[PDB]
Amino acid sequence: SPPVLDLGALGQDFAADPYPTYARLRAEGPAHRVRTPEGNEVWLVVGYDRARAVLADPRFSKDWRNSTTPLTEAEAALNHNMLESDPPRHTRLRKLVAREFTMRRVELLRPRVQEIVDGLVDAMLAAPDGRADLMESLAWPLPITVISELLGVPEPDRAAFRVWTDAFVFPDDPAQAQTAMAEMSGYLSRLIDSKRGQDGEDLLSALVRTSDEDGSRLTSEELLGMAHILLVAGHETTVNLIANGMYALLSHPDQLAALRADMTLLDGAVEEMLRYEGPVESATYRFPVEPVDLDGTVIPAGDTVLVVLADAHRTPERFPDPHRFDIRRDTAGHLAFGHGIHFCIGAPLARLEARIAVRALLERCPDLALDVSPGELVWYPNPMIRGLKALPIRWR
Ligand code: HEM
Numbered sequence: 428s429p430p431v432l433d434l435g436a437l438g439q440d441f442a443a444d445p446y447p448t449y450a451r452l453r454a455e456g457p458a459h460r461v462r463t464p465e466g467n468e469v470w471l472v473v474g475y476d477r478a479r480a481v482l483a484d485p486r487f488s489k490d491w492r493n494s495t496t497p498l499t500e501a502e503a504a505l506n507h508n509m510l511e512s513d514p515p516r517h518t519r520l521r522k523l524v525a526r527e528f529t530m531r532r533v534e535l536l537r538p539r540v541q542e543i544v545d546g547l548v549d550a551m552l553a554a555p556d557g558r559a560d561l562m563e564s565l566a567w568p569l570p571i572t573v574i575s576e577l578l579g580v581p582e583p584d585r586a587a588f589r590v591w592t593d594a595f596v597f598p599d600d601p602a603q604a605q606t607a608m609a610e611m612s613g614y615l616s617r618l619i620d621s622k623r624g625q626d627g628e629d630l631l632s633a634l635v636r637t638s639d640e641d642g643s644r645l646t647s648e649e650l651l652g653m654a655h656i657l658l659v660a661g662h663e664t665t666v667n668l669i670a671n672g673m674y675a676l677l678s679h680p681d682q683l684a685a686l687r688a689d690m691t692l693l694d695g696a697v698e699e700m701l702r703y704e705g706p707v708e709s710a711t712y713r714f715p716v717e718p719v720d721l722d723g724t725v726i727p728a729g730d731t732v733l734v735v736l737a738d739a740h741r742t743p744e745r746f747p748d749p750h751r752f753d754i755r756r757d758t759a760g761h762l763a764f765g766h767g768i769h770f771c772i773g774a775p776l777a778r779l780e781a782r783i784a785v786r787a788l789l790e791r792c793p794d795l796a797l798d799v800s801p802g803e804l805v806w807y808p809n810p811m812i813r814g815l816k817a818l819p820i821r822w823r
């Protein structure tokens with residue numbers, strides 16, 4: 428049970444390029460005890476077949492009642508949400524919003540998502556020197572705007588979320604992440620109270636009435652948990668898809684040129700962005716309900732287990748020539764949105780946002796290029812998140 432590797436000790440080189448580390452683990456076997464840079468001891472599961480199996484394996488629970496790790500008040504306040512639940516709670520909670528997120532319902536959002544991206548790109552192109560940070564200009568504001576509109580988060584409240592997620596992803600120290608959790612929990616409880624009795628038609632207003640009409644269908648703690656998960660999971664990964672995906676495309680001129688020559692390759696290109704540079708480096712916490720033996724390594728009941736999606740996607744038996752970004756590759760079966768009962772409910776909306784943003788950038792910036800050498804980029808060390816601090820670009 429002591430870790431074999433402290434990922435914090437490896438520093439920024441590991442954050443920027445974690446792949447050799449994970450591949451070395453994979454060659455030793457499927458599961459490994461590590462300490463993360465944040466100080467948590469966890470098991471990593473590596474290798475595509477084992478990763479896909481554990482994601483779908485009901486022996487691995489998502490409910491903190493099966494973890495041996497105790498929670499703070501702030502943590503406990505937010506965890507009654509579907510991603511941190513098992514059936515039957517999972518089943519009930521996801522049913523409450525499944526209809527909002529279907530391919531057909533999401534498709535009705537297209538004109539508004541297009542308007543948002545057109546507006547943000549209009550503002551970017553107005554820059555004096557034909558330079559911007561893609562993160563600040565597009566990748567961050569697009570997804571927070573879309574989820575905020577859907578939920579009903581007023582415009583001046585939205586900037587706080589970048590501060591909070593910065594604190595959850597890359598905390599200066601553990602106290603800072605706890606403070607941000609406490610702040611966010613209080614804000615969401617205020618926002619829920621502010622919708623009650625206001626006859627709003629946004630999704631948070633509907634969820635507040637669902638809870639008030641029957642507390643057995645959605646309890647007040649699950650109402651706060653649902654607001655939390657939809658708002659945070661509903662933008663944070665999309666931001667990094669857009670920036671990671673655009674970094675990949677701009678880093679590979681042959682693929683960029685293939686896309687420009689045939690824009691019907693756009694959906695496959697966004698799938699290979701997910702496969703090659705997806706934002707979820709490792710899935711969210713799983714806890715074995717009983718001891719689980721993975722090819723002779725026994726993970727104790729209750730320990731925290733991270734499924735390393737990033738290493739599954741570089742397993743060459745499953746994705747041949749895995750280090751090549753190839754927008755024409757067969758990407759079907761990637762794990763970037765997970766697999767099994769927790770498979771991302773946001774996938775149609777994430778795809779719609781990322782496809783619209785990538786198309787608008789290529790159409791509106793015919794000479795788009797990176798305005799930064801790779802060595803000036805700064806990546807997050809947390810093995811759960813693959814993402815950049817900034818992505819400077821330039822166009823004609
Ligand atoms: C490119 C963007 C996205 C990626 C890569 C992504 C990835 C994932 C993954 C890997 C999981 C499952 C995690 C696990 O099993 O541990 C998941 C779950 C989830 N995602 Fe996404 N996501 C994205 C965008 C979105 C959006 C736009 C929404 C807004 C609805 C959203 C809402 C959720 C929620 C609520 C869950 C929990 C589902 C459940 O437990 O049944 N996600 N996402």
Ligand code: NA
Pocket residue numbers: 442708806807808809810811812813814
């Ligand atoms: Na990382």
